[PDB]
Structures are given as C-alpha cells and as structure tokens.
Amino acid sequence: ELRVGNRYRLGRKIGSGSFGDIYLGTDIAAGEEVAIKLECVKTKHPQLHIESKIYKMMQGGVGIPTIRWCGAEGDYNVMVMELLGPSLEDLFNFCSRKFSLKTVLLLADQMISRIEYIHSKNFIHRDVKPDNFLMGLGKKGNLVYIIDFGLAKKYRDARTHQHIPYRENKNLTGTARYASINTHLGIEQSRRDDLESLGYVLMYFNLGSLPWQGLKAATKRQKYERISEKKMSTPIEVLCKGYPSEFATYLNFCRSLRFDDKPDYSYLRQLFRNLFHRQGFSYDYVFDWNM
C-alpha cells in the first residue's frame, strides 16, 4: 500500500488549501483516521515547513489542531494532522444554509477567541472563512477549531511588539467573498482585517448569502470586480439591516481600526455576549446541527 511516514496510509484527496492538497489518511499504527497535507517539493519557495512551525507555536492554544508528523517523502513535503469534524461550511450546508441567531453567537464568541489567540502569538491568519473553522470530535464537539496557517504572516516582532510597516500593493490572499475592504484595495493586512472578515462570515451565516455573492459575470475577472465593488458600495447599515445592531457595530468597529491598532477583543465578545443574554439564550451548546 502507498504510505507516508511509513505509518500513514494515504487515501483520497479531500480538498485543497494554501499551497497544497489535503488527503484522508489512516494512522496505520494507532488505527485512527487523520488528515494529510502534501506539498510538491519542486518549488523555489516551499511553504509546508513554515506552516508546520506556525502550528507548533500555536499548540498551546485551545482549538488549534494537533500536528502528528512533519517530513519529506519523495516528491512531497508531508504534514499529518489530527482529523477533526466538519467545517462550519459543511455544517452550514447540513443546516440548509441558515444558522439561528443563537448558533451564530455561540460561534462568534469562539471564533473571536481563536483569532485573538493567533494575534497574541504575533501572527495574522489572512484566510478567515467558514471552511477554515472545524468542530471537534466527541467531548470536544462543542469546540470550534481554526485551521490552515499557509497564508499566515507575522504582523509584529515578538520582543518589541513593533508592528510591520504600512504598505500598499500587496496581493489578495484568501477568498474574495470574505476579504476585508482594505485587502481589496491592496493594503497590507493586519489584525483588523482578520476580524473584519469574521464579521462578513457572521453576516453570511445570518443571511444565508452575502449581497456580493452570485453576481452574474461572464469572465472571471468581472466576477471578482463585481464582488469588490458591491462590497465597497454596500454600507454596513444596509448589509446588516433587520439583524441585531451588534453585527453592524462589530463590522464598523473592525473597519475603523487603525492599521497597527490592537483590537479590543473583549469589547467585541461582550457585544455578542450581552446580546446572547438579552435574547434569553442559555450556554447549553445546542447548535442548530444538534437539532
């Protein structure tokens, strides 16, 4: 059988992320199913080792997947990770593409804390999207994980907390649908941009779709610019109309952060936490997919 690490049976391809493909694998020893990321070694700028080092720096964090093994075999760099449960996009589809307010708020609280944690380790994620959040397994089925550090970048020095300089003409990184407005404008990303993207993700869960989704386009350049210009032309107060004002406050707060500002994560969490209590929700972690 085809094995990597002389321990991991390789199975079918199950997705493609930053700079590499993801495969199902089986810990042929432990007997557990795993996820296996492969990067073709035939490149002048390999990334998987860099990503692995970011994960390993993160593993003191709640909701960061465990790395099981890192190595090079034949034509591929290999990173084996703990296999988690479905992505938030998967669960969104299981729930026919609408989440209740309570689920969105329960998710929002944990997703802000994952991003805060990454920032506390001097990195920005730069690919905040529903597919990059996965629920845990078993007694960790209530826990939201964040994955994929292939687009991550250090935003400050560990010692001085000197922020990376302000720069323009930086290329777009992750998905267009959730990119911050500044990212469309080619501005270097910082902490504010991870959080603004989360704001779009939350409104996506509330609405079923964002207003810059499904814009008719013949070529694929004209589909991106219609995303960019609909996102730039749709005020937050229009985007969040008919939803609790916290979501508009969240997005306005994130859009108004200065490039090098430290976000007040606690205030953002309390915004949603206080709304959670006003709606009379309880913390029983019964998400839409548990019903």
Numbering used by the authors: 2 to 292
Tell me, in the authors' exact words, what the paper reports:
We discovered a conformational switch in the activation loop of CK1 that regulates its activity on two regulatory regions in PER2 that control its stability and circadian timing in mammals.
Since the first structure of CK1δ published in 1996, nearly all CK1 structures have been determined after crystallization with high concentrations of sulfate or citrate anions. Therefore, CK1 has an anion-dependent switch in its activation loop.
